[model samples]
Target: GCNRLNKKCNSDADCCRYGERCISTGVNYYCRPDVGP
Candidate 1:
């Protein structure tokens, strides 16, 4: 688990937390917190 806010990562597996996901911002990827319904 590596939940570094706004930090660059390779994939979703690099993200931490239960609902965190990897987002591609064109240049790089970042870990974002998910908001479940």
Candidate 2:
């Protein structure tokens, strides 16, 4: 298991750190974080 951001993943609970989530664009899951101002 890898707790990384923007990294390739298979599931949300697979690879993602705190506050980070796995996002997919019909291809693969990518770990991402929120950044809004």
Candidate 3:
């Protein structure tokens, strides 16, 4: 999820790579890094 794209996507193909998907501040993607819960 990003400010520009504003949607949940599986990969870069789903949204813009730089402007929308790339988050410079906090966690890049809302996706969980580790697989386990």
Candidate 4:
């Protein structure tokens, strides 16, 4: 399940990928690579 990158998501769990997370950029929420602490 660790093959997603930009799928629509709402939480960290939604990302599925171990190094990915649901990020907010305006009104969009997608699973992207973790970029912060």
Tens-digit lDDT string for candidate 3 (1-37): 3344444456655555545552223434432222222
Output the TM-score of candidate 4. 0.57
| Candidate 2 regions with alpha-carbon error over 4 angstroms | 1-3, 35-37
| Candidate 3 colliding pairs | none
Backbone clash count for every predicted candidate, in the order shown: 0, 1, 0, 0
Scored against the true structure, residue 31 in model 3 reaches a CA lDDT of 26
RMSD of each: 3.0, 4.4, 10.9, 3.4
- The candidate, 2 or 3, that scores higher on TM-score is 2
Top candidate by lDDT:
4
TM-score ranking from best to worst? 1, 4, 2, 3
Mind sharing the TM-score for model 1?
0.58
Worst 10 residues of 4 by lDDT: 28-37
Candidate 3 Cα lDDT to native: 0.42
Model 2 C-alpha lDDT versus the unseen true structure:
0.67
C-alpha lDDT values of all predictions = 0.69, 0.67, 0.42, 0.71
Candidate 3 ranges beyond 4 A from true positions = 1-4, 22-37
TM-score of each: 0.58, 0.55, 0.36, 0.57
lDDT of 1 by residue, 1-37 (tens): 4346577768876876556777877788887777633
Model 4 root mean square deviation, Cα atoms: 3.4
Superpose all Cα atoms of candidate 3 onto the true structure and report the RMSD in Å to 1 decimal.
Answer: 10.9
